[PDB]
């Protein structure tokens, strides 16, 4: 299940495996908009969904994967090493890896902490 994220500065697209309740429940809440929040070298936003179940949790990811941040109802978008590591790009919590940054991996560095995402399903 694709999802395209347009911002003011640029855009990306992320793609999420439909085996997961959160992806199905997100289908009720797309398109949507949000404040693009930032933390070091990741971007997240206050999603309108609320699920805390996690079918495939991890404690580190690649520079091009996507999770959900259940405890704060946020997304994540990991595109560099945040300040919360030493060896490897560990996130703020044991987040699932349910999605992939299929696109946008350089334009994410040029966003601000408020470039108004407007999320869509992609395949427009």
From TrEMBL:
Residues 1-120 form the Cyclophilin TM1367-like domain. Gene3D superfamilies: 2.40.100.20. InterPro entries: Cyclophilin-like_dom_sf, Cyclophilin_TM1367, TM1367-like. It comes from the Bacteria. This is Cyclophilin TM1367-like domain-containing protein. It comes from Thermotoga maritima (strain ATCC 43589 / DSM 3109 / JCM 10099 / NBRC 100826 / MSB8).
